Amino acid sequence: RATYTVIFKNASGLPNGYDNWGWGCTLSYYGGAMIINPQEGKAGAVSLKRNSGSFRGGSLRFDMKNEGKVKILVENSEADEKFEVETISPSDEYVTYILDVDFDLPFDRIDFQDAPGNGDRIWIKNLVHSTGSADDFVDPINLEHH
């Protein structure tokens, strides 16, 4: 059985049980989105840090729109180890991404970074981890709608 962990659907603030250990960004909340406003020259990131425990492998599902290129990473904060999941091209419309996490350590941080460091906004909603793969992902969000 896959375990689906909904981190947030609509956000009005930081997800419950998480902190932001990122840098070089201002966050705001509107239309249910976490709106990341990175500062120019900082290669800013949100780093969602789980207060307790860790995820392992599996996959990350989220809706995003983004004015520039966005790098997705995870980290294990104990080993001080970081892993690049994917780099995602700009889109002016929300797109649903479901990405395998092939990191061979547990991860307690999930990062969205303004990779080019030009200060391009990022918008995120509906962020979910599965213990199962991307191909096998059955979206609980689309599914609750239907």
C-alpha atoms as a PDB file:
ATOM      1  CA  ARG A   1       0.000   0.000   0.000  1.00  0.00           C
ATOM      2  CA  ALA A   2       1.381   3.437  -0.937  1.00  0.00           C
ATOM      3  CA  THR A   3       1.280   6.095   1.806  1.00  0.00           C
ATOM      4  CA  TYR A   4       0.242   9.461   0.482  1.00  0.00           C
ATOM      5  CA  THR A   5       1.290  12.442   2.638  1.00  0.00           C
ATOM      6  CA  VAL A   6      -0.537  15.641   1.743  1.00  0.00           C
ATOM      7  CA  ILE A   7       1.808  18.486   2.764  1.00  0.00           C
ATOM      8  CA  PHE A   8      -0.600  21.190   1.659  1.00  0.00           C
ATOM      9  CA  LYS A   9      -3.496  21.711  -0.762  1.00  0.00           C
ATOM     10  CA  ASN A  10      -4.466  25.351  -0.428  1.00  0.00           C
ATOM     11  CA  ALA A  11      -1.974  27.358   1.635  1.00  0.00           C
ATOM     12  CA  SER A  12      -2.615  30.422   3.768  1.00  0.00           C
ATOM     13  CA  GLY A  13       0.747  30.019   5.550  1.00  0.00           C
ATOM     14  CA  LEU A  14       3.448  27.388   6.052  1.00  0.00           C
ATOM     15  CA  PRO A  15       2.211  23.810   5.878  1.00  0.00           C
ATOM     16  CA  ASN A  16       1.282  22.343   9.214  1.00  0.00           C
ATOM     17  CA  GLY A  17       4.248  20.569  10.811  1.00  0.00           C
ATOM     18  CA  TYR A  18       6.781  22.420   8.580  1.00  0.00           C
ATOM     19  CA  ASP A  19       9.164  25.336   8.815  1.00  0.00           C
ATOM     20  CA  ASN A  20      10.930  27.222   5.990  1.00  0.00           C
ATOM     21  CA  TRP A  21      14.705  26.948   6.266  1.00  0.00           C
ATOM     22  CA  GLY A  22      15.166  28.572   2.879  1.00  0.00           C
ATOM     23  CA  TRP A  23      16.862  31.879   2.077  1.00  0.00           C
ATOM     24  CA  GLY A  24      16.681  34.847  -0.225  1.00  0.00           C
ATOM     25  CA  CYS A  25      12.860  34.817  -0.575  1.00  0.00           C
ATOM     26  CA  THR A  26       9.770  36.565   0.664  1.00  0.00           C
ATOM     27  CA  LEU A  27       6.650  34.325   0.891  1.00  0.00           C
ATOM     28  CA  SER A  28       3.024  35.399   0.538  1.00  0.00           C
ATOM     29  CA  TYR A  29      -0.281  33.505   0.210  1.00  0.00           C
ATOM     30  CA  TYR A  30      -3.140  34.109  -2.200  1.00  0.00           C
ATOM     31  CA  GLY A  31      -5.650  31.993  -4.130  1.00  0.00           C
ATOM     32  CA  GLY A  32      -4.432  29.059  -2.071  1.00  0.00           C
ATOM     33  CA  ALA A  33      -0.949  29.281  -3.470  1.00  0.00           C
ATOM     34  CA  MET A  34       2.359  29.550  -1.684  1.00  0.00           C
ATOM     35  CA  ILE A  35       3.854  32.446  -3.608  1.00  0.00           C
ATOM     36  CA  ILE A  36       7.658  32.534  -3.547  1.00  0.00           C
ATOM     37  CA  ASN A  37       9.241  35.846  -4.433  1.00  0.00           C
ATOM     38  CA  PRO A  38      12.998  35.280  -4.653  1.00  0.00           C
ATOM     39  CA  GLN A  39      15.410  38.209  -4.496  1.00  0.00           C
ATOM     40  CA  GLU A  40      17.701  38.910  -7.483  1.00  0.00           C
ATOM     41  CA  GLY A  41      21.220  37.571  -7.156  1.00  0.00           C
ATOM     42  CA  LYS A  42      20.403  35.231  -4.218  1.00  0.00           C
ATOM     43  CA  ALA A  43      19.481  32.009  -6.029  1.00  0.00           C
ATOM     44  CA  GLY A  44      16.771  31.970  -3.372  1.00  0.00           C
ATOM     45  CA  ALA A  45      14.847  28.964  -2.298  1.00  0.00           C
ATOM     46  CA  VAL A  46      12.074  27.799  -0.126  1.00  0.00           C
ATOM     47  CA  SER A  47      13.260  24.804   1.881  1.00  0.00           C
ATOM     48  CA  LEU A  48      10.248  23.098   3.545  1.00  0.00           C
ATOM     49  CA  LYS A  49      11.712  21.457   6.641  1.00  0.00           C
ATOM     50  CA  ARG A  50       9.742  18.751   8.282  1.00  0.00           C
ATOM     51  CA  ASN A  51       9.569  19.456  12.074  1.00  0.00           C
ATOM     52  CA  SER A  52       9.756  15.708  12.781  1.00  0.00           C
ATOM     53  CA  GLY A  53      10.700  12.590  10.836  1.00  0.00           C
ATOM     54  CA  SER A  54      11.683  12.016   7.206  1.00  0.00           C
ATOM     55  CA  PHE A  55      10.346  10.772   3.847  1.00  0.00           C
ATOM     56  CA  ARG A  56      12.082   8.010   1.872  1.00  0.00           C
ATOM     57  CA  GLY A  57      12.282   7.679  -1.906  1.00  0.00           C
ATOM     58  CA  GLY A  58       8.903   7.592  -3.610  1.00  0.00           C
ATOM     59  CA  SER A  59       7.610  10.689  -5.451  1.00  0.00           C
ATOM     60  CA  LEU A  60       6.599  14.304  -5.116  1.00  0.00           C
ATOM     61  CA  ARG A  61       3.478  15.672  -6.747  1.00  0.00           C
ATOM     62  CA  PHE A  62       2.710  19.384  -6.908  1.00  0.00           C
ATOM     63  CA  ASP A  63       1.054  22.034  -9.092  1.00  0.00           C
ATOM     64  CA  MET A  64       3.386  24.825 -10.124  1.00  0.00           C
ATOM     65  CA  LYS A  65       3.629  27.933 -12.244  1.00  0.00           C
ATOM     66  CA  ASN A  66       6.819  29.834 -12.511  1.00  0.00           C
ATOM     67  CA  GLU A  67       8.176  32.806 -14.460  1.00  0.00           C
ATOM     68  CA  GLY A  68      11.644  31.225 -14.635  1.00  0.00           C
ATOM     69  CA  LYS A  69      13.472  27.913 -14.310  1.00  0.00           C
ATOM     70  CA  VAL A  70      12.872  26.170 -10.949  1.00  0.00           C
ATOM     71  CA  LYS A  71      15.098  23.470  -9.435  1.00  0.00           C
ATOM     72  CA  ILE A  72      13.501  20.917  -7.130  1.00  0.00           C
ATOM     73  CA  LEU A  73      15.714  19.307  -4.477  1.00  0.00           C
ATOM     74  CA  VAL A  74      15.524  17.269  -1.321  1.00  0.00           C
ATOM     75  CA  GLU A  75      17.918  17.168   1.582  1.00  0.00           C
ATOM     76  CA  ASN A  76      18.818  15.070   4.574  1.00  0.00           C
ATOM     77  CA  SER A  77      19.761  17.662   7.144  1.00  0.00           C
ATOM     78  CA  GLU A  78      21.668  15.194   9.461  1.00  0.00           C
ATOM     79  CA  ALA A  79      24.148  14.088   6.775  1.00  0.00           C
ATOM     80  CA  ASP A  80      24.116  17.624   5.355  1.00  0.00           C
ATOM     81  CA  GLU A  81      23.321  16.107   1.986  1.00  0.00           C
ATOM     82  CA  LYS A  82      21.386  17.609  -0.883  1.00  0.00           C
ATOM     83  CA  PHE A  83      19.945  15.918  -4.028  1.00  0.00           C
ATOM     84  CA  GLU A  84      18.586  17.435  -7.273  1.00  0.00           C
ATOM     85  CA  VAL A  85      15.247  15.929  -8.289  1.00  0.00           C
ATOM     86  CA  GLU A  86      14.481  17.989 -11.378  1.00  0.00           C
ATOM     87  CA  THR A  87      14.750  21.271 -13.207  1.00  0.00           C
ATOM     88  CA  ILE A  88      11.436  22.676 -14.548  1.00  0.00           C
ATOM     89  CA  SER A  89      10.926  25.153 -17.372  1.00  0.00           C
ATOM     90  CA  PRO A  90       8.856  28.285 -17.024  1.00  0.00           C
ATOM     91  CA  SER A  91       5.060  28.090 -17.373  1.00  0.00           C
ATOM     92  CA  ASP A  92       2.531  30.936 -16.994  1.00  0.00           C
ATOM     93  CA  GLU A  93      -0.220  28.362 -16.195  1.00  0.00           C
ATOM     94  CA  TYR A  94      -0.339  25.799 -13.382  1.00  0.00           C
ATOM     95  CA  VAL A  95       1.113  22.426 -14.383  1.00  0.00           C
ATOM     96  CA  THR A  96       0.895  19.202 -12.317  1.00  0.00           C
ATOM     97  CA  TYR A  97       4.290  17.562 -11.882  1.00  0.00           C
ATOM     98  CA  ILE A  98       4.886  14.105 -10.465  1.00  0.00           C
ATOM     99  CA  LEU A  99       8.556  13.386  -9.971  1.00  0.00           C
ATOM    100  CA  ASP A 100      10.461  10.346  -8.765  1.00  0.00           C
ATOM    101  CA  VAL A 101      12.818  10.914  -5.865  1.00  0.00           C
ATOM    102  CA  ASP A 102      15.842   8.660  -6.466  1.00  0.00           C
ATOM    103  CA  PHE A 103      17.822   9.949  -3.440  1.00  0.00           C
ATOM    104  CA  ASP A 104      19.261   7.012  -1.492  1.00  0.00           C
ATOM    105  CA  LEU A 105      18.940   8.809   1.876  1.00  0.00           C
ATOM    106  CA  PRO A 106      15.833   9.860   3.824  1.00  0.00           C
ATOM    107  CA  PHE A 107      14.861  13.495   3.327  1.00  0.00           C
ATOM    108  CA  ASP A 108      13.340  15.963   5.742  1.00  0.00           C
ATOM    109  CA  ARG A 109      13.607  19.011   3.453  1.00  0.00           C
ATOM    110  CA  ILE A 110      11.951  19.693   0.132  1.00  0.00           C
ATOM    111  CA  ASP A 111      13.346  22.671  -1.815  1.00  0.00           C
ATOM    112  CA  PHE A 112      12.043  24.847  -4.601  1.00  0.00           C
ATOM    113  CA  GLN A 113      14.834  27.101  -5.856  1.00  0.00           C
ATOM    114  CA  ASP A 114      15.029  30.111  -8.171  1.00  0.00           C
ATOM    115  CA  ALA A 115      17.844  28.498 -10.088  1.00  0.00           C
ATOM    116  CA  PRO A 116      18.902  31.372 -12.480  1.00  0.00           C
ATOM    117  CA  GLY A 117      18.696  33.772  -9.505  1.00  0.00           C
ATOM    118  CA  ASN A 118      16.886  36.452 -11.538  1.00  0.00           C
ATOM    119  CA  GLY A 119      14.139  36.894  -8.921  1.00  0.00           C
ATOM    120  CA  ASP A 120      11.389  35.041 -10.831  1.00  0.00           C
ATOM    121  CA  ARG A 121       8.243  34.184  -8.808  1.00  0.00           C
ATOM    122  CA  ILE A 122       7.169  30.619  -8.125  1.00  0.00           C
ATOM    123  CA  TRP A 123       3.626  29.508  -7.221  1.00  0.00           C
ATOM    124  CA  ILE A 124       2.935  26.163  -5.537  1.00  0.00           C
ATOM    125  CA  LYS A 125      -0.186  24.306  -4.497  1.00  0.00           C
ATOM    126  CA  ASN A 126      -1.210  20.726  -3.839  1.00  0.00           C
ATOM    127  CA  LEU A 127       2.072  19.280  -2.646  1.00  0.00           C
ATOM    128  CA  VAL A 128       1.989  15.570  -1.846  1.00  0.00           C
ATOM    129  CA  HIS A 129       4.556  12.862  -1.260  1.00  0.00           C
ATOM    130  CA  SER A 130       3.944   9.220  -2.160  1.00  0.00           C
ATOM    131  CA  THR A 131       6.088   6.310  -0.976  1.00  0.00           C
ATOM    132  CA  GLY A 132       5.400   4.762  -4.398  1.00  0.00           C
ATOM    133  CA  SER A 133       6.700   5.840  -7.810  1.00  0.00           C
ATOM    134  CA  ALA A 134       5.586   8.600 -10.162  1.00  0.00           C
ATOM    135  CA  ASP A 135       4.171   6.223 -12.752  1.00  0.00           C
ATOM    136  CA  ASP A 136       2.115   4.446 -10.026  1.00  0.00           C
ATOM    137  CA  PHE A 137       0.920   7.707  -8.440  1.00  0.00           C
ATOM    138  CA  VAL A 138      -2.875   7.903  -8.022  1.00  0.00           C
ATOM    139  CA  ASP A 139      -3.583  11.515  -7.218  1.00  0.00           C
ATOM    140  CA  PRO A 140      -5.700  11.892  -4.052  1.00  0.00           C
ATOM    141  CA  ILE A 141      -6.332  15.558  -4.916  1.00  0.00           C
ATOM    142  CA  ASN A 142      -7.914  14.954  -8.403  1.00  0.00           C
ATOM    143  CA  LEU A 143      -9.665  12.086  -6.875  1.00  0.00           C
ATOM    144  CA  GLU A 144     -11.318  13.928  -3.931  1.00  0.00           C
ATOM    145  CA  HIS A 145     -12.638  16.430  -6.584  1.00  0.00           C
ATOM    146  CA  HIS A 146     -14.358  13.617  -8.505  1.00  0.00           C
END
